[PDB]
Design a protein around this ligand. Structure first.
Ligand SMILES: Nc1ncnc2c1ncn2[C@@H]1O[C@H](COP(=O)(O)OP(=O)(O)O)[C@@H](O)[C@H]1O
Ligand SMILES: Nc1ncnc2c1ncn2[C@@H]1O[C@H](COP(=O)(O)OP(=O)(O)O)[C@@H](O)[C@H]1O
Ligand SMILES: [Mg+2]
Ligand SMILES: [Mg+2]
Lengths: 371, 475, 371
C-alpha cells in the first residue's frame, strides 16, 4: 500500500503520496463564504467555497483561515479542508491509506486529540501518525545534528537536535510569522496613501510582500540610501491597474523578524532567540549546532536573509567558532519532503497507530508512549 | 433506431384490405454526434460508393470520407455489409416504385447538401461580438445546390430576423450559436426528408379498399446496455422502461380479470407505481430530463454544475438516484439509476452540448422561398391567444417526450400482444450457447420482471380433477 | 399552463407569453381623453382612448402618461392599460396565467405593494412575481457578470452583477431618460423657428428624435464642422407638410446624456456614473466589469453611442485595461427576452407568490426573500 503525507501547516495545505519527490497538491488553507444575496436564480451557488477556488472568487467572498497560530480554531472549516484535500485534490479514498500529519512544538493537547479523533471517526483512516514539523525538516536536509528554524506563516520555532536526540528544554517558540508581517505591511502602506482593509485584498498585500520585500544586510545604511536616493523604489501592478510604487517600505516589513518591537512584541529577535537556544543546550555540542544551522518555512525565503542572520549570529557568537547557515532552494517544501522520506522508511511501519489500538485504548493513545 | 410501426387494416367482412406504415422516435443526434467506435447512418457511406461516379461528379463530392467533418469523427468504415450492391438494390427498388428519377436525384443532392454544412467556418469579428464567415466556397456550392443565394444564407445565419410586436428586428449571433443553428437545421431537414419519404411510401402502398379495424405491429429498439451509456442510450432505456411499465399494467389487468372470473380476488394493489417511481424521476418536473432542459438554457452551464445540481436535488431525496460504481476499470461513471433491467450508469460529459436544438426561422423562410422541392418538406414550421414555443427554447429531450406521449395516447387504444426474440449465441454456430448473452437478453426483455410479478401472488393453479387424480393416493 | 411576461416599462408596454422569442404586443402606454365637445349624435364616442388606438386620434385627445419616472402616478390609468393589454391585445383571461412583472430598482415600496394588490384582486391572477430590469437584461445577454446600464424612457440605472451576485451599494440611478431628451429637443428646436407645445406634438418631436438624432464622437469638432459645413443638415416631413431642416440640433439633443448640465441637472454624465459604479465595487472584480459592460434600453439605441462611451471610459480607466462594450442590435427588447427566459426556467416555478401566500401574509409579502 501507500501512505499519505498531509501537512496542514497554516495558510498553505500541501499533500501527496509518500515516496514522491515533491508534494502533489498545494493550495491555500482558506474557507470563503458569500457575503451577498445573489439575484440570478437557477445557478445554485454552493454555500462555501473551499481551497484554491476561493482565490478565484475573492471579490464576492469573505475568507477565513481555520488556523490562527498553529492551533485549529474552527473545526468545521478544517474538516471541510481535509475533505476537499482527500476527495478533490488527490481524488483518493482515505479508507485504505495511512496518514502522516505534522504540527508545531508546544501545542495544546486538545488540538492533537481532537485531530486524531476526527481522522479516525469521520474519515476512518486505517492508521495515522503525528510528527513535529522540525524533525521532518531535519530529515529532508540529509543531516542528523544542528538546530532547525522553521518560520512558517503561523508560528516560528527553533528545535536543536544532536545525533538524533532532541533537547526539549531548549526548544523555543515565537508567535511572529508571515501573517504578522502581512498585517504590518498593510499597516505601513497607509503612510504612502494606499488603504487595504478588506480580507480579499490582504491576499494582494501578501503578493506584494512575496514579490518585492527583501531583507537588508544593514538597517541604518539602507535607510540612509533610501532617504537620499530613489534607486530602491519598485512598482507593482494591482489587479485593477493604478500601479503603485513602494520604496522604504520594501525592506521595513521583513525587519520585524529581527526587530519585534515594531509590532509591539517584547520578545527578542530571531537571531537572538537562536543564539539563546544555542547556549541553552550543553557545552560539548555547541560547535556542531553553530556549524549546522538549518532554515525552513516560507518566511525564510526573503532574499538576503541568510547573510543577515549569519552576520548577526557571528556578532553574537565567539569569534573562534565557525558559523554556517544552510539555505537550500526548497525551504518551503522541505517539511513535506522530510515527511515523505520518513513515511517511506521500513522501520517506521511499526510506529503507526492502528485503528484497533485507538478504539481499545481511546484517543489519548497519541500522547501516551505509543507516540 | 426508429420505431417502425405497421397497421394492417381489414374490410367490413373481416378480409384483408390494405396496410399503413408510420415511423416514430427517430433519433437525430446520430446525424451530427457519433461515438468513437460507432458509425453514422448508412446513407452517407453508401453515397460515397465509387461504383456510381456520375453522382459524385455532379454533386462535387470529395471522394475521401476523411476530409469531411460529420463522418470522420466516428468510425470510418467496417465490414458490416457491402454498400455497393445494397445501394444498387435500393436504387432499383426506388426505380420500380411509383415516382420518377428526378425525385431520386433530389434526395441524393439534398443528402449531399446535408453533407457540406460541416465545412462552414466562422470567425469572430475583430471589432464586434458578432462572428462573420471566413470561407465561402463551401457555402457558395451549397447555395448553388439548393438554388438559394449564398449571400442571403450567410446573412440569415449571421443575422437572423425576428418579429417583435409589429416590426422586424435583427438578432446577433456568436460562433457557438450559429454552429448550433447549423446543426439543428441539418437535423431538422434530415427528419423532414425521412418523414416525407415515409408519407410517399405509405401513399404508394395505399389501395382503395375501405379501412376498418386494424391490427398493429410495433418494432422498437431494445433496452441496450453499454459500459459508456450516454444521452441516446438514456432515451432508449426510458422508452423501453415506459413500454415495460405498460406491459406490467396490462398483465395486472389480465390477472384481475382472471381473478374476478374465478372469484378468487385478493391483493388488489396495482403493479404500476412500483416501476412508475423511476419514471417519475425522468419526465416529471425537477427530474433529470427537466433539469437538463433548464440547464442548457442557462447561459453559463457546465457539466460540473449540472452534476452538482443533480446531486443536490436527487441524492438521498429520491429512491432511485444513487452514486455510480467502478468495476474492472470502467472508463468513467457519473451517476447510476435502478431500472427493471438492473443498475445502469450514465456519463454526463457531452450531454449539454448535444441537447440543444435551436432552429433558425429566417433560414426556414428562405427554404420556403427556394426554387427546389425542399419547400414542400419545410412548408410549415416555427379569439383566444394561445402561445407557441420560441426557437431558442428547443431541445431534443422535449420532442422525444412529446413523441413518446403521442405514441402512448395511440398504442393504449388497442389491446396489446407481446413477442420476444432471443439470440441463442454470439456466433453463427447452431446449438452452442453463451449463458451470459442469454442472461442479458432475458434481463433486457423483462421476462424476469414478469416472473417476479407472478411469484408474489399465486402462480401455480391446478384443476381439482388433476389434483385429485395425482395427489389423492397420498391420503 | 403557461406563464405570461408583461413589461410596463415607461412609454412602451410590451407583453407576451413566456418562452417566446419576442413580445407579441408592443404599444405606447398612453391614455387619451377628448378635449372638445362633439356635435354628431349617434356615433357615441367612448370617454377614454387607451393604447396605440390613441395614436390614431392623437389630434383630438390630451395624451397622458400614467407613469413619470418608473413610479405610477395615475392608478386608474394603469388599470386601464393592464386591462387593455390583457383583453384587447393578448385576448387571454389572466385567471389561469401566472404573471411576471418588471420593476426598476430603488422605488417606493408602496408601488410594488399596490401593483401586487391590483394584480391579485382586480384580475385574480393565480400567482405573480416581480423582477428587476438589470437582472433580466443580463439574462438576455447570455452573461453572468458585468455591469449593465439600462436606459429606458423613464430612468437610467447602472447595476453591477458578478457571478450572479449583486452589489446593492454600487447600484446607481439617474432620472435623466428619453422623456427629458425629448423635452430638451423641444426647447432647442424653438431657436430655429419651430414651436411645439401641445401634447400631441410631443409624439412628432419624439419621432424626429428617434429618426434623426445621433451621438457625436467629439462635441467641439462636430460643432466646428457644422458651423461651416452644411452636410449635417437633414430634412423631415411633418404629417401635414412644410418640411423642416435641422442642422447641429440633431447631435446636440443626445449630448445631454453625457452633458446633463445642459438641462440643469447637477449629476454627471452616464459615462462617469458607470465608472464611479465600477470603482464602487470590490477591487478584485473590476477587470471583469470593465470587460463585460452591457447596454440595454431604448435610449441606448442612438448611433455612435457605443463608441463614444468606450472612448470616455477608456479615457477615465487605466490604460492597461481592455474596455469592451456589448451593444446587441435588440437593445430595446432585451429586458422582455430576459424575462421570458427567466419565466421559462423550471426551478423558477417554486418562487411564484401564490394566491394563498398573499392572502395569508397580506400585500407586504412582496418584500420577503421572494424579492
Ligand atoms: N519568497 C517569499 N517571500 C516572502 N514571503 C514568502 C515567500 N515564500 C513564502 N512566503 C510566505 O510564507 C507563508 C507560507 O508559509 P508556509 O511555509 O506555508 O507555512 P505552513 O507550512 O505553516 O503553512 C506565506 O504566507 C508567504 O507570505
Ligand atoms: N432608434 C432610436 N433612437 C433613439 N431613441 C430611441 C430609438 N428607439 C427608441 N428610442 C427611445 O427609447 C424610448 C423607449 O424606451 P423603452 O425601452 O420603452 O423604456 P422602458 O423599457 O422603460 O419602457 C422612447 O421614448 C424613445 O425616445
Ligand atoms: Mg509550516
Ligand atoms: Mg425599461
Amino acid at each position: 500500500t501507500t501512505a499519505l503525507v498531509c501537512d496542514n501547516g497554516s495558510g498553505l495545505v500541501k499533500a501527496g503520496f509518500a515516496g514522491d519527490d515533491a508534494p502533489r497538491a498545494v493550495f491555500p488553507s482558506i474557507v470563503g463564504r458569500p457575503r451577498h444575496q445573489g439575484v440570478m436564480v437557477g445557478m445554485g451557488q454552493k454555500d462555501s467555497y473551499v481551497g484554491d477556488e476561493a482565490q478565484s472568487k475573492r471579490g464576492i467572498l469573505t475568507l477565513k483561515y481555520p488556523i490562527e497560530h498553529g492551533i485549529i480554531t474552527n473545526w468545521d472549516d478544517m474538516e471541510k479542508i481535509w475533505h476537499h484535500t482527500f476527495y478533490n485534490e488527490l481524488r483518493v479514498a482515505p479508507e485504505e491509506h495511512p496518514t502522516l500529519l505534522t504540527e508545531a512544538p508546544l501545542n495544546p493537547k486538545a488540538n492533537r486529540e481532537k485531530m486524531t479523533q476526527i481522522m479516525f471517526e469521520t474519515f476512518n483512516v486505517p492508521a495515522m501518525y503525528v510528527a513535529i514539523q522540525a524533525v521532518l525538516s531535519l530529515y529532508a536536509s540529509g543531516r542528523t545534528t544542528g538546530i532547525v528554524l522553521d518560520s512558517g506563516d503561523g508560528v516560528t520555532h527553533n528545535v536543536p537536535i544532536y545525533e538524533g536526540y532532541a533537547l526539549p528544554h531548549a526548544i523555543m517558540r515565537l508567535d511572529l510569522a508571515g501573517r504578522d508581517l502581512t498585517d504590518y505591511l498593510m499597516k505601513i502602506l497607509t503612510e504612502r496613501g494606499y488603504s487595504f482593509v478588506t480580507t480579499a485584498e490582504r491576499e494582494i498585500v501578501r503578493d506584494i510582500k512575496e514579490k518585492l520585500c527583501y531583507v537588508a544586510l544593514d538597517f541604518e545604511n539602507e535607510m540612509a540610501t533610501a532617504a537620499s536616493s530613489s534607486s530602491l523604489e519598485k512598482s507593482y501592478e494591482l489587479p485593477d491597474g493604478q500601479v503603485i510604487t513602494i520604496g522604504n517600505e520594501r525592506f521595513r516589513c521583513p525587519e520585524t523578524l529581527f526587530q519585534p518591537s515594531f509590532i509591539g512584541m517584547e520578545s527578542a529577535g530571531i537571531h537572538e532567540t537562536t543564539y539563546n537556544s544555542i547556549m541553552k543546550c550543553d557545552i560539548d555540542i555547541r560547535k556542531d549546532l553553530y556549524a549546522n544551522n538549518v532554515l525552513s518555512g516560507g518566511t525564510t525565503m526573503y532574499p538576503g536573509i541568510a547573510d543577515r542572520m549569519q552576520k548577526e549570529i557571528t556578532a553574537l557568537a565567539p569569534s573562534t567558532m565557525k558559523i554556517k547557515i544552510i539555505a537550500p532552494p526548497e525551504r518551503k517544501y522541505s517539511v513535506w519532503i522530510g515527511g515523505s522520506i520518513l513515511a517511506s522508511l521500513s522501520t517506521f511501519q511499526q510506529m503507526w497507530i492502528s485503528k484497533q489500538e485507538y478504539d481499545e485504548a481511546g484517543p489519548s493513545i497519541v500522547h501516551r508512549k505509543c507516540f | 433506431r426508429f420505431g417502425k410501426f405497421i397497421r394492417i387494416h381489414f374490410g367490413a367482412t373481416g378480409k384483408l384490405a390494405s396496410a399503413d406504415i408510420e415511423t416514430y422516435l427517430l433519433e437525430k443526434s446520430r446525424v451530427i454526434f457519433q461515438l468513437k467506435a460507432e458509425r453514422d447512418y448508412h446513407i452517407f457511406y453508401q453515397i460515397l460508393s465509387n461504383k456510381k461516379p456520375e453522382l459524385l461528379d455532379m454533386l462535387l463530392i470529395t471522394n475521401n470520407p476523411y476530409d469531411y467533418a460529420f463522418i470522420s469523427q466516428g468510425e470510418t468504415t467496417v465490414a458490416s455489409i457491402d454498400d455497393a450492391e445494397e445501394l444498387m438494390a435500393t436504387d432499383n427498388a426506388f426505380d420500380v416504385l411509383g415516382f420518377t428519377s428526378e425525385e431520386k436525384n433530389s434526395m441524393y443532392k439534398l443528402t449531399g447538401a446535408i453533407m457540406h454544412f460541416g465545412n462552414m467556418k466562422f470567425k469572430g469579428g475583430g471589432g464586434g461580438g458578432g462572428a462573420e464567415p471566413d470561407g465561402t466556397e463551401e457555402a457558395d456550392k451549397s447555395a448553388y445546390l439548393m438554388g438559394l443565394n449564398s449571400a442571403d444564407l450567410l446573412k440569415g445565419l449571421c443575422h437572423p430576423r425576428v418579429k417583435v410586436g409589429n416590426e422586424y428586428v435583427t438578432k446577433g449571433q456568436n460562433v457557438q450559436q450559429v454552429i448550433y443553428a447549423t446543426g439543428a437545421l441539418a437535423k431538422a431537414v434530415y427528419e423532414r426528408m425521412f418523414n416525407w419519404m415515409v408519407t410517399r411510401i405509405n401513399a404508394t402502398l395505399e389501395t382503395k379498399q375501405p379501412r376498418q379495424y386494424f391490427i398493429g405491429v410495433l418494432d422498437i429498439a431494445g433496452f441496450e446496455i453499454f459500459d459508456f451509456n450516454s444521452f441516446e442510450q438514456l432515451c432508449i432505456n426510458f422508452t423501453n422502461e415506459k413500454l415495460q411499465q405498460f406491459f406490467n399494467h396490462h398483465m395486472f389487468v389480465l390477472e384481475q380479470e382472471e381473478y374476478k372470473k374465478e372469484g378468487i380476488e385478493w391483493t388488489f394493489i396495482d403493479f404500476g407505481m412500483d416501476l412508475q417511481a423511476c419514471i417519475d424521476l425522468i419526465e416529471k418536473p425537477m427530474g433529470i430530463m427537466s433539469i437538463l432542459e433548464e440547464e442548457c438554457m442557462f447561459p453559463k452551464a457546465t457539466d460540473m454544475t449540472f452534476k452538482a445540481k443533480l446531486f443536490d436535488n436527487h441524492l438521498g431525496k429520491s429512491a432511485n438516484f444513487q452514486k455510480p460504481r467502478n468495476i474492472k476499470g470502467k472508463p468513467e461513471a457519473h451517476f447510476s439509476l435502478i431500472h427493471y433491467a438492473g443498475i445502469v450508469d450514465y456519463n454526463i460529459i457531452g450531454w449539454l452540448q448535444k441537447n440543444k436544438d435551436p432552429l433558425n426561422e429566417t433560414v426556414v423562410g428562405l427554404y420556403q422561398k427556394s426554387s427546389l422541392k425542399l419547400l414542400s418538406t419545410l412548408f410549415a414550421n416555427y379569439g383566444k391567444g394561445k402561445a407557441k414555443k420560441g426557437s431558442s427554447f428547443q431541445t431534443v429531450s422535449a420532442l422525444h417526450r412529446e413523441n413518446l406521449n403521442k405514441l402512448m395516447t395511440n398504442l393504449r387504444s388497442t389491446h396489446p400482444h407481446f413477442v420476444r426474440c432471443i439470440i441463442p449465441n454470439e456466433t453463427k454456430s447452431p446449438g452452442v450457447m453463451d449463458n451470459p448473452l442469454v442472461m442479458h437478453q432475458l434481463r433486457c426483455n423483462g421476462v424476469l420482471e414478469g416472473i417476479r410479478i407472478c411469484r408474489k401472488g399465486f402462480p401455480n393453479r391446478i384443476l381439482y380433477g388433476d389434483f385429485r387424480q395425482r395427489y389423492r393416493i397420498l391420503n
